[PDB]
Amino acid sequence: ANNPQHSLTKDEIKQYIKEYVQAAKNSIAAGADGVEIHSANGYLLNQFLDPHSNTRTDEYGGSIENRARFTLEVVDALVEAIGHEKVGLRLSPYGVFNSMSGGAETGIVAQYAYVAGELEKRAKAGKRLAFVHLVEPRVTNPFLTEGEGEYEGGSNDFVYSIWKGPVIRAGNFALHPEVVREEVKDKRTLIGYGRFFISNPDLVDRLEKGLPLNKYDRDTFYQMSAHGYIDYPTYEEALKLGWGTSSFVKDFKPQALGDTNLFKPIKIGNNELLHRAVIPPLTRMRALHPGNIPNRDWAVEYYTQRAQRPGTMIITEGAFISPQAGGYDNAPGVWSEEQMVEWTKIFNAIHEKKSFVWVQLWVLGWAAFPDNLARDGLRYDSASDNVFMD
Numbered sequence: 183a184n185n186p187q188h189s190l191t192k193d194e195i196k197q198y199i200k201e202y203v204q205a206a207k208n209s210i211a212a213g214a215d216g217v218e219i220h221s222a223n224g225y226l227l228n229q230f231l232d233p234h235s236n237t238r239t240d241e242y243g244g245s246i247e248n249r250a251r252f253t254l255e256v257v258d259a260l261v262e263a264i265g266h267e268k269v270g271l272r273l274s275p276y277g278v279f280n281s282m283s284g285g286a287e288t289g290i291v292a293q294y295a296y297v298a299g300e301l302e303k304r305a306k307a308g309k310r311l312a313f314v315h316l317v318e319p320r321v322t323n324p325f326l327t328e329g330e331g332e333y334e335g336g337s338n339d340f341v342y343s344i345w346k347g348p349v350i351r352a353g354n355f356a357l358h359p360e361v362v363r364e365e366v367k368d369k370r371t372l373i374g375y376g377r378f379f380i381s382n383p384d385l386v387d388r389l390e391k392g393l394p395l396n397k398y399d400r401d402t403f404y405q406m407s408a409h410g411y412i413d414y415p416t417y418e419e420a421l422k423l424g425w426g427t428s429s430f431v432k433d434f435k436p437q438a439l440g441d442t443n444l445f446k447p448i449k450i451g452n453n454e455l456l457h458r459a460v461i462p463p464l465t466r467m468r469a470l471h472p473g474n475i476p477n478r479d480w481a482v483e484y485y486t487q488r489a490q491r492p493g494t495m496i497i498t499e500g501a502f503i504s505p506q507a508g509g510y511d512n513a514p515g516v517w518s519e520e521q522m523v524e525w526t527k528i529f530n531a532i533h534e535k536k537s538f539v540w541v542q543l544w545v546l547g548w549a550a551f552p553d554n555l556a557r558d559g560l561r562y563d564s565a566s567d568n569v570f571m572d
């Protein structure tokens with residue numbers, strides 16, 4: 183291979199940690215309310231957590247404790263740098279996307295239970311993270327249609343026995359208000375809505391009142407276009423455009439969720455949320471190349487539209503902490519001044535709408551395109567060098 187997969191040295195791990203710290207500082211300085219550490223969906227930190235991808239025989243692999251080391255080191259570094267109430271963590275225990283193990287690995291629950299335990303231990307010491315964000319076994323692969331890749335053999339409920347702080351849960355909840363109604367009975371549970379927040383800028387209103395949902399268009403999830411980004415209508419706008427039952431999701435039977443805890447306020451980090459419908463991180467690939475710069479034409483509008491319900495928590499699309507952490511030309515970064523100038527405008531707009539914004543800090547590992555990295559003189563990184571993405 184022109185850019186063969188490289189097993190990180192300890193010094194290189196330390197360098198990533200340094201970059202996470204700087205990226206977090208950059209985000210806060212630009213106006214972000216906090217950061218989310220991406221340790222899910224088969225990216226670098228998840229590659230260390232997972233025994234399929236991590237075959238290391240040093241202190242970063244070979245046991246549950248060792249596999250959790252990198253993730254916990256990033257947590258600790260960020261808590262020290264910017265404060266515990268400005269840091270969250272995302273995990274996907276049952277995910278198989280990007281060649282992670284999922285439930286087929288009998289030790290997977292123990293691996294994640296250990297992480298949760300260590301977070302609770304830190305919480306007892308007065309350093310409780312703002313939240314833990316879980317992808318549900320409802321969606322083990324987000325590129326499969328709702329209802330597909332639903333793992334029936336495991337639950338994330340174990341996390342609640344261990345971690346005693348806020349929990350955001352994401353995965354196929356928009357089409358299932360009956361499930362949400364039950365899950366939000368737990369008073370520290372928030373619900374992330376991904377794909378349907380792409381297509382419904384006023385999703386929160388629609389959830390409250392039980393309105394029909396705009397269909398989403400997969401083909402414009404990742405595209406350099408305003409189309410499928412900023413041109414999805416609100417419900418009132420849709421009706422004025424003459425949209426009928428054909429433009430909305432077919433055979434979906436909405437429920438008004440306004441009478442549930444989903445519409446009770448809750449404090450997350452330093453923010454008083456007015457409801458518990460969260461926008462999870464959603465990569466959209468509108469960032470400019472070269473430079474991984476947030477889009478100057480459409481991004482402010484995209485986030486403004488989705489911030490429209492006051493007191494909404496928004497987690498940004500994954501943002502690279504450094505060039506070496508990247509490998510997708512059209513995903514944004516948070517390492518450079520030219521990037522932060524644009525992020526500042528995005529954060530401004532969200533705050534104008536009385537909503538909140540958390541930057542997801544992203545490192546790709548083996549999910550990167552090695553050819554892009556090679557072009558830029560960068561390594562193709564992962565936990566090991568003898569196991570590869572499918």
Ligand SMILES: Cc1cc2nc3c(=O)[nH]c(=O)nc-3n(C[C@H](O)[C@H](O)[C@H](O)COP(=O)(O)O)c2cc1C
Pocket residue numbers: 220222223272317321324325352353354355356374375376377378403404462463464465466499500542
């Ligand atoms: C187009 C798209 C982009 C996504 N980008 C990210 C991302 O950048 N970071 C992340 O942690 N998850 C990302 N996800 C996963 C979602 O946050 C979410 O967990 C998943 O879509 C399931 O929720 P849903 O059924 O409500 O869409 C993405 C999903 C989609 C469909």
